[PDB]
Motif scaffolding. Structure first.
Motif, PDB file in Angstrom:
ATOM      1  N   UNK A  40       0.781  -1.230   0.000  1.00 13.26           N
ATOM      2  CA  UNK A  40       0.000   0.000   0.000  1.00 13.26           C
ATOM      3  C   UNK A  40       0.818   1.289   0.000  1.00 13.26           C
ATOM      4  N   UNK A  41       0.468   2.203  -0.900  1.00 15.54           N
ATOM      5  CA  UNK A  41       1.137   3.497  -0.983  1.00 15.54           C
ATOM      6  C   UNK A  41       0.043   4.547  -1.111  1.00 15.54           C
ATOM      7  N   UNK A  42       0.285   5.714  -0.523  1.00 13.36           N
ATOM      8  CA  UNK A  42      -0.688   6.798  -0.549  1.00 13.36           C
ATOM      9  C   UNK A  42      -0.136   8.007  -1.307  1.00 13.36           C
ATOM     10  N   UNK A  43      -1.030   8.766  -1.929  1.00 16.32           N
ATOM     11  CA  UNK A  43      -0.640   9.950  -2.679  1.00 16.32           C
ATOM     12  C   UNK A  43      -1.807  10.919  -2.556  1.00 16.32           C
ATOM     13  N   UNK A  44      -1.809  11.690  -1.474  1.00 14.61           N
ATOM     14  CA  UNK A  44      -2.897  12.620  -1.232  1.00 14.61           C
ATOM     15  C   UNK A  44      -4.082  11.795  -0.778  1.00 14.61           C
ATOM     16  N   UNK A  45      -5.223  11.983  -1.431  1.00 12.17           N
ATOM     17  CA  UNK A  45      -6.448  11.238  -1.119  1.00 12.17           C
ATOM     18  C   UNK A  45      -6.553   9.978  -1.975  1.00 12.17           C
ATOM     19  N   UNK A  46      -5.486   9.669  -2.702  1.00  6.29           N
ATOM     20  CA  UNK A  46      -5.461   8.530  -3.616  1.00  6.29           C
ATOM     21  C   UNK A  46      -4.580   7.364  -3.146  1.00  6.29           C
ATOM     22  N   UNK A  47      -5.183   6.180  -3.036  1.00  6.39           N
ATOM     23  CA  UNK A  47      -4.480   4.971  -2.607  1.00  6.39           C
ATOM     24  C   UNK A  47      -4.299   3.963  -3.733  1.00  6.39           C
ATOM     25  N   UNK A  48      -3.147   3.310  -3.740  1.00  4.88           N
ATOM     26  CA  UNK A  48      -2.865   2.272  -4.713  1.00  4.88           C
ATOM     27  C   UNK A  48      -2.604   1.024  -3.888  1.00  4.88           C
ATOM     28  N   UNK A  49      -3.437   0.005  -4.062  1.00  3.72           N
ATOM     29  CA  UNK A  49      -3.253  -1.242  -3.327  1.00  3.72           C
ATOM     30  C   UNK A  49      -2.895  -2.354  -4.307  1.00  3.72           C
ATOM     31  N   UNK A  50      -1.647  -2.807  -4.272  1.00  5.47           N
ATOM     32  CA  UNK A  50      -1.211  -3.889  -5.146  1.00  5.47           C
ATOM     33  C   UNK A  50      -1.566  -5.217  -4.490  1.00  5.47           C
ATOM     34  N   UNK A  51      -2.354  -6.015  -5.196  1.00  9.52           N
ATOM     35  CA  UNK A  51      -2.801  -7.304  -4.700  1.00  9.52           C
ATOM     36  C   UNK A  51      -2.048  -8.434  -5.411  1.00  9.52           C
ATOM     37  N   UNK A  52      -1.381  -9.278  -4.632  1.00  6.70           N
ATOM     38  CA  UNK A  52      -0.603 -10.398  -5.172  1.00  6.70           C
ATOM     39  C   UNK A  52      -0.900 -11.700  -4.432  1.00  6.70           C
ATOM     40  N   UNK A  53      -1.338 -12.727  -5.164  1.00 10.22           N
ATOM     41  CA  UNK A  53      -1.666 -14.023  -4.563  1.00 10.22           C
ATOM     42  C   UNK A  53      -1.449 -15.169  -5.551  1.00 10.22           C
ATOM     43  N   UNK A  54      -1.870 -16.379  -5.178  1.00  9.42           N
ATOM     44  CA  UNK A  54      -1.723 -17.533  -6.067  1.00  9.42           C
ATOM     45  C   UNK A  54      -2.676 -17.438  -7.254  1.00  9.42           C
ATOM     46  N   UNK A  55      -3.707 -16.607  -7.122  1.00  4.30           N
ATOM     47  CA  UNK A  55      -4.710 -16.436  -8.170  1.00  4.30           C
ATOM     48  C   UNK A  55      -4.412 -15.357  -9.209  1.00  4.30           C
ATOM     49  N   UNK A  56      -3.873 -14.226  -8.767  1.00  2.87           N
ATOM     50  CA  UNK A  56      -3.619 -13.131  -9.690  1.00  2.87           C
ATOM     51  C   UNK A  56      -2.733 -12.059  -9.079  1.00  2.87           C
ATOM     52  N   UNK A  57      -2.381 -11.077  -9.900  1.00  2.00           N
ATOM     53  CA  UNK A  57      -1.568  -9.944  -9.472  1.00  2.00           C
ATOM     54  C   UNK A  57      -2.170  -8.722 -10.137  1.00  2.00           C
ATOM     55  N   UNK A  58      -2.871  -7.901  -9.365  1.00  2.00           N
ATOM     56  CA  UNK A  58      -3.491  -6.707  -9.923  1.00  2.00           C
ATOM     57  C   UNK A  58      -3.283  -5.472  -9.057  1.00  2.00           C
ATOM     58  N   UNK A  59      -3.538  -4.308  -9.650  1.00  2.00           N
ATOM     59  CA  UNK A  59      -3.402  -3.029  -8.966  1.00  2.00           C
ATOM     60  C   UNK A  59      -4.767  -2.365  -8.830  1.00  2.00           C
ATOM     61  N   UNK A  60      -5.175  -2.102  -7.595  1.00  2.00           N
ATOM     62  CA  UNK A  60      -6.454  -1.461  -7.331  1.00  2.00           C
ATOM     63  C   UNK A  60      -6.182  -0.019  -6.906  1.00  2.00           C
ATOM     64  N   UNK A  61      -6.742   0.928  -7.652  1.00  2.00           N
ATOM     65  CA  UNK A  61      -6.545   2.344  -7.372  1.00  2.00           C
ATOM     66  C   UNK A  61      -7.875   3.044  -7.104  1.00  2.00           C
ATOM     67  N   UNK A  62      -7.925   3.846  -6.042  1.00  2.00           N
ATOM     68  CA  UNK A  62      -9.145   4.567  -5.684  1.00  2.00           C
ATOM     69  C   UNK A  62      -8.898   5.877  -4.929  1.00  2.00           C
ATOM     70  N   UNK A  63      -9.884   6.764  -4.984  1.00  2.00           N
ATOM     71  CA  UNK A  63      -9.819   8.041  -4.290  1.00  2.00           C
ATOM     72  C   UNK A  63     -10.906   8.003  -3.223  1.00  2.00           C
ATOM     73  N   UNK A  64     -10.591   8.472  -2.021  1.00  2.00           N
ATOM     74  CA  UNK A  64     -11.572   8.476  -0.938  1.00  2.00           C
ATOM     75  C   UNK A  64     -12.819   9.262  -1.351  1.00  2.00           C
ATOM     76  N   UNK A  65     -13.999   8.673  -1.152  1.00  2.00           N
ATOM     77  CA  UNK A  65     -15.241   9.356  -1.486  1.00  2.00           C
ATOM     78  C   UNK A  65     -15.717   9.254  -2.927  1.00  2.00           C
ATOM     79  N   UNK A  66     -14.941   8.582  -3.767  1.00  2.00           N
ATOM     80  CA  UNK A  66     -15.304   8.412  -5.170  1.00  2.00           C
ATOM     81  C   UNK A  66     -15.535   6.929  -5.427  1.00  2.00           C
TER      82      UNK A  66
END
Length: 131
Positions: A40-66
């Protein structure tokens, strides 16, 4: 805060939660031992959560309140938003197919990350240790 890498350590009533969601015995066992890792890394109100497991590897990006769309590893699609209250992240979601509600909470307890879920009267948790 939330910055850094976290590795899943233990689950509480996670298999019951997946059963209520409609997942079969075989896929529930694979889900319980997924070796999930979150970066997890933060950039203002924007978070990037990198998800890594036996099933997949994806990047989830979101802004608080959106609001945004998210997909589970089995194909189930969700829509919702995350907000920040106190020092916790609280998220309100809805399944796109049957319209039922799903709540999630993320909070820090010492040096552990606790994630709680609630769906149709069932509660489950997954606990991560910091790298």
């Amino acid at each position: 805060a939330f910055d850094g890498t976290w590795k899943v350590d233990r689950n509480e009533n996670y298999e019951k939660f997946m059963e209520k969601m409609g997942i079969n015995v075989v896929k529930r066992k694979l889900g319980a031992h997924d070796n999930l890792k979150l970066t997890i890394t933060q950039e203002g109100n924007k978070f990037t959560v990198k998800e890594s497991s036996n099933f997949r590897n994806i990047d989830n990006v979101f802004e608080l309140g959106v609001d945004f769309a998210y997909s589970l590893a089995d194909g189930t699609e969700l829509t919702g938003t995350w907000t920040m209250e106190g020092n916790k992240l609280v998220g309100k979601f809805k399944r796109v197919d049957n319209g039922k509600e799903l709540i999630a909470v993320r909070e820090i307890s010492g040096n552990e990350l606790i994630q709680t879920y609630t769906y149709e009267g069932v509660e489950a948790k997954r606990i991560f240790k910091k790298e």
